[PDB]
Design a protein around this nucleic acid. Structure first.
Lengths: 164, 206, 218
RNA sequence: GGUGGUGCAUGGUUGUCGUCAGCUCGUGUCGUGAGAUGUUGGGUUAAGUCCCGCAACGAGCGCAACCCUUGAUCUUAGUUG
RNA sequence: CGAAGGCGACUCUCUGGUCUGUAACUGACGCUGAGGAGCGAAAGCGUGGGGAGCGAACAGGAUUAGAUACCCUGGUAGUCCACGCCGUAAACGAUGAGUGCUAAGUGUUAGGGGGUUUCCGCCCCUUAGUGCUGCAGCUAACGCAUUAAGCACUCCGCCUG
RNA sequence: UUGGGCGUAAAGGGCUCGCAGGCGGUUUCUUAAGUCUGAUGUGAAAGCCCCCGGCUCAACCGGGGAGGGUCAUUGGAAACU
RNA sequence: AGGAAGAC
């Protein structure tokens, strides 16, 4: 489900990288910039872009992240349950916390989760330290989650007899 | 090992000369004297940013026309520059001079002014990349058909000297009826010496 | 008319089975046409294209089946919907800025060929421009006068125009297509299983849908 | 004032591969990514020159043309021929 | 075909397994397996044979700067049989054994059952191998994919720059 | 174990027969060894933590609770091993 | 299936 552009987004960049290519006259040099873009109301996307100029890569990455967005569950400013984001040899274990701990996360993961607007999540990185793989792992993890009321309507029960 | 200078390649066939006269058997000392006029005009009018001067002989009178594209900070009260230039030029060359000024409408398509603009931001010590992008934006918002810009030298890095290019639109250097305006400017900064080459495809000639 | 009885439906038994699992032993040896599920899938397609007429932008068709291209082109020109008759260029929905600036150049050249200065050199402008018009008007098709993003799409064959449904997948366009039995009907519940190459059957169904939206437009 | 050192502190010029035919970008697809596509394939050309399929559609510097000279003729212009 | 190494002329004696069908039996007798025992290509060793061809070693002829090598001419041990030994290979599917679920297409080997036949073949189920493409799914990619490197359970072996 | 892997990165024994060992198809009664749950006695006092008081909160000093048990006796439950 | 040819 594509989301429209009628939102205010904070487009805080996470990482640029010096990227090479070898040709007969030596090396050509580009910059691959990946950013994370999303409002505090529970929508997050990431973006990647290659350019010969760093702000050009920035605008390309923010256009790609505006193209690709996904919405996260934000009930009680903290995720409903424990999850493991698993993609590509990065394993981000996400666990909900009580309401005063603050977000405890590694760098790219804390950028994504703080840009989501979660308040209290304990996460651990059990995989590799590659930033794009952490980003794809944590977005797959945040996509995997589901509402308590969604579980209620798919099981045909009500939220009070799910909780007790 | 580079391209031949486009104004020097276009003169004589498509481009009219900036000097329209003949001298016989005194050709040498007229070239020496009128280059003394051109260096003096450049030295005292670099603030007023002349694009080009062009001269002619009137049988032991000389006519000078100067293209500056603004009267504003140039003419003063209107007669100040013509008295302070005509008497001084009379004192230098010893011959009868006449001076006239001309203006360029849509004034951001003249290459010598563009290269002087780049050079002026380089002694203003704003960043060269910002200078390139701002001048590209200025030339397209004035309107044009192609711009190619080059700045070479030590661009802030001490141990390496490398050039940077920025272009937009079509600038064919090999079509003859193309009317490229070309300009080379020289900038002296605390880092060293920087060369600017800007060349602009303004229009077409049938 | 909705009678069926025209098409056998497919080529020989090297086919992709999608209904194989719970079919009992039958003395016919092949499937018989399910007329009730056929008429209700045609009814829900009828209601969906009634909604498509309710916003008003009807449909754009794509195809490359050369036994049916001129026929679906003349049906498109008769009944007002849009068409891809020749080879469908890649990335129409994603490069629509390039497509709209190209179609803007078609408006400029199609006005300068008749209103502007016609004779400045006798043959070179003719052999460049008229051939260039012929190339773009044969390779672009009837997608000229949209001035907007498309709303819905029908495909002659998902296997033959395989990347079109990928672009519609990416940019979230509701999809309509007749499928053969080697195709993938598993994606969308709105499906038209019929013979993709029988010209009489495809003319019957496209004529029924064209007359359906013709009576839906008012 | 240095025709004194530093071309590996530099602009400004030049040769070279090489008149070789190639070198890239915008938008978009494919890929976790570096990247790829366009720019490959077929037929011809001296050429990425032209055209037909093709997740590509286009654009830019190049190639070719426009420039000069030598190759026949009409009009005008005949001296210092 | 064999558990692996491996096994291709034909005949005989002895002998080990494997597969299909049945439902006549016993009624959980099953899986895995540290140490242990047994096999185990080629080369090698001991004793006695045999030695056609090939042929390490070794010698002559070239080529090269040298050429203890490739190339040519010979040629001992070996390769073959019987009795023992050593116990290694890129001993390879570089994939431990067992059991069960998970889309299809197409060959081949050995069967069983049905539709006008005890005629030729034609189709559909059906195992047990043996291939080749190819989903979901897995992988870091290559790739694997009912002969899993998928989803599980048991037991063993092994790794920690 | 919670919390890794073994085609190509380090990592499948050359393969088999099997002792001890490690696991075990369905049903029905039976015991309570494993399992779960009460009661009692114990796991000293200082220590960590929970709640109050004092030296100008304080560092510390006190007063009352929670356990660090595959702990011993005994009662109860029979789904699973 | 159509020559031996070293080093930086």
């Amino acid at each position: 489900r594509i989301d429209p552009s009628k939102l205010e987004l904070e487009e805080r960049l996470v990482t640029v990288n010096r990227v090479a290519k070898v040709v007969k006259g030596g090396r050509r040099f580009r910059f691959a910039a990946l950013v994370v873009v999303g409002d505090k109301n529970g929508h997050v996307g990431f973006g990647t872009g290659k350019a010969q100029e760093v702000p050009e890569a920035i605008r390309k990455a923010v256009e790609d992240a505006k193209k690709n967005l996904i919405e996260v569950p934000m009930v009680g400013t903290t995720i409903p349950h424990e999850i493991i984001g698993r993609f590509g040899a990065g394993n981000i274990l996400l666990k909900p916390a009580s309401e005063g701990t603050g977000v405890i996360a590694g760098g790219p993961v804390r950028a994504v989760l703080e840009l989501a607007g979660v308040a209290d999540i304990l996460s651990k990185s059990l995989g590799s330290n590659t930033p794009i793989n952490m980003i794809r792992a944590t977005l797959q993890g945040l996509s995997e989650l589901k509402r308590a009321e969604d579980v209620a309507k798919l099981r045909g029960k009500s939220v009070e007899e799910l909780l007790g | 090992g580079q391209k031949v200078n486009p104004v020097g390649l276009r003169i004589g066939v498509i481009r009219d000369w900036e000097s329209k006269w003949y001298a016989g058997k005194d050709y040498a000392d007229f070239l020496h004297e009128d280059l003394k006029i051109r260096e003096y005009i450049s030295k005292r009018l670099s603030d007023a940013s002349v694009s080009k001067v062009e001269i002619e002989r009137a049988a032991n009178r000389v006519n000078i026309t100067i293209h500056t594209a603004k009267p504003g900070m140039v003419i003063g009260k209107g007669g100040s520059e013509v008295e302070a230039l005509r008497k001084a030029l009379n004192s230098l060359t010893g011959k009868r001079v006449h001076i006239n000024i001309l203006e360029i409408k849509r004034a951001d398509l003249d290459a010598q002014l563009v290269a002087d603009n780049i050079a002026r931001q380089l002694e203003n010590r704003v960043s060269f990349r910002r200078a390139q992008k701002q001048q590209i934006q200025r030339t397209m918002r004035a309107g044009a058909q192609g711009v190619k810009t080059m700045v070479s030298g030590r661009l802030g890095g001490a141990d390496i000297a490398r050039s940077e290019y920025y272009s937009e639109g079509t600038v064919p250097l090999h079509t003859l009826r193309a009317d490229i305006d070309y300009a080379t400017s020289e900038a002296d900064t605390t880092y060293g010496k920087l060369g600017v080459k800007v060349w602009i495809y303004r229009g077409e000639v049938l | 008319l909705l009678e069926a009885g025209v098409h056998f439906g497919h080529q020989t038994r090297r086919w992709n089975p999608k209904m194989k699992r719970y079919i009992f032993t039958e003395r016919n040896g092949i499937y018989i046409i399910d007329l009730q599920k056929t008429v209700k899938k045609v009814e829900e397609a009828y209601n969906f294209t009634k909604n498509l007429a309710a916003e008003g932008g009807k449909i754009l068709f794509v195809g490359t089946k050369k036994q049916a291209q001129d026929s679906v082109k003349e049906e498109a020109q008769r009944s007002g919907m849009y068409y891809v008759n020749q080879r469908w260029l890649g990335g129409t929905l994603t490069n629509f800025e390039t497509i709209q600036k190209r179609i803007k150049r078609l408006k400029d050249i199609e006005k300068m060929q008749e209103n502007g200065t016609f004779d400045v050199l006798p043959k070179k402008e003719v052999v460049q421009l008229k051939k260039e018009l012929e190339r773009l008007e044969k390779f672009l098709g009837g997608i000229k006068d949209m001035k907007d993003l498309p709303d819905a799409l029908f495909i002659i064959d998902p296997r033959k125009e395989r990347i079109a449904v990928a672009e519609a997948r990416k940019l979230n366009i509701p999809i309509i297509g007749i499928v053969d039995t080697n195709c993938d009907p598993d994606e969308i519940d709105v499906v038209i299983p019929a013979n993709d190459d029988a010209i009489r059957a495809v003319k019957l169904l496209t004529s029924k849908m064209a007359d359906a939206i013709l009576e839906a437009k008012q």
